[PDB]
């Protein structure tokens, strides 16, 4: 169920500075490339060890494409200020998500090409890779414009071609890395957070990928009638952390069990205070 995606962003702030352009590439939800106009030497950069298999000519070719996207964005950004009759005084954001989904059979399943302005859906290439869906009156202008120039056939060509061809390549050089994991190291803490009541916290640390599932259960059905579960978060070193706790009557703490589900773990983890 592989996939490739390019998340591009352009933001303008008042000042003599041209808007900031950022492009992050993803292979199976894993960042592998990145370009940031705010760098001393703007060039796409390797973000996964398997990408160093690519030669200088690949990085130039991509950096040039970034260069052009940057202009396409800064230009587009200005057209939108017009469409929306907005005041040149604040800040504005233009975002794009592009890429393609593949089945494990290396077969293309779907193409993606959509844009957002100010964080709200703007215009999107439908799944038929031929027609457009425009969010508002402004988008109707872009829709008309991309229909007359036959834009879709172009992105359609990227989606069924380039996207699919290059995604096969990366998967081939990066399957080694991609399939790797880092088992979560769980444990449970005890916090006197009450009287006649206590708070148990189950922890999952240093795991990877981010996908993971934690559960509580006073032997029998599970507990969601007092379980807190923070959003998984990055450790800063490449792995992630996450926890969940539940209020328990002081003296029964040891009677609750925590189960941790991750695929780097040969089997589910069971833990008690």
């Amino acid at each position: 169920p592989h996939s490739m995606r390019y998340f591009e962003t352009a933001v303008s702030r008042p000042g003599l500075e041209e808007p900031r352009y950022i492009s992050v590439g993803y292979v199976d939800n894993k960042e592998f490339v990145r370009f940031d106009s705010d760098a001393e030497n703007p060039r796409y950069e390797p973000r996964a060890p398997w990408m160093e298999q690519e030669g200088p000519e690949y990085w130039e070719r991509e950096t040039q494409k970034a260069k052009g996207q940057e202009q396409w964005f800064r230009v587009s950004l200005r057209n939108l200020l017009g469409y929306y009759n907005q005041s040149a005084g604040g800040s504005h954001t233009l975002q794009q998500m592009s890429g393609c989904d593949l089945g494990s059979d290396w077969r293309l399943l779907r193409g993606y090409l959509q844009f957002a302005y100010e964080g709200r859906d703007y215009i999107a290439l439908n799944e038929d890779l031929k027609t457009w869906t425009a969010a508002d009156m402004a988008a109707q202008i872009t829709r008309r414009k991309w229909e007359q120039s036959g834009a879709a056939e172009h992105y359609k060509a990227y989606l069924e071609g380039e996207c699919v061809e290059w995604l096969h390549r990366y998967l081939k050089n990066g399957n080694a890395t991609l399939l790797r994991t880092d088992s979560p190291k769980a444990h449970v803490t005890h916090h006197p957070r009450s009287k006649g009541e206590v708070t148990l916290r189950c922890w999952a640390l240093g795991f990877y990928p981010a996908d993971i599932t934690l559960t509580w259960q006073l032997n029998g059905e599970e507990l969601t009638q007092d379980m807190e579960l923070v959003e998984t978060r990055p450790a800063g070193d490449g792995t992630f952390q996450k926890w969940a706790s539940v209020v328990v009557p002081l003296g029964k703490e040891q009677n609750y069990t925590c189960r941790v589900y991750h695929e780097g773990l040969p089997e589910p983890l069971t833990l008690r205070w």
Partner: peptide
């Protein structure tokens, strides 16, 4: 490989 946009918005 990165996409290369077509007609601006």
């Amino acid at each position: 490989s990165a996409v290369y946009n077509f007609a601006t918005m």
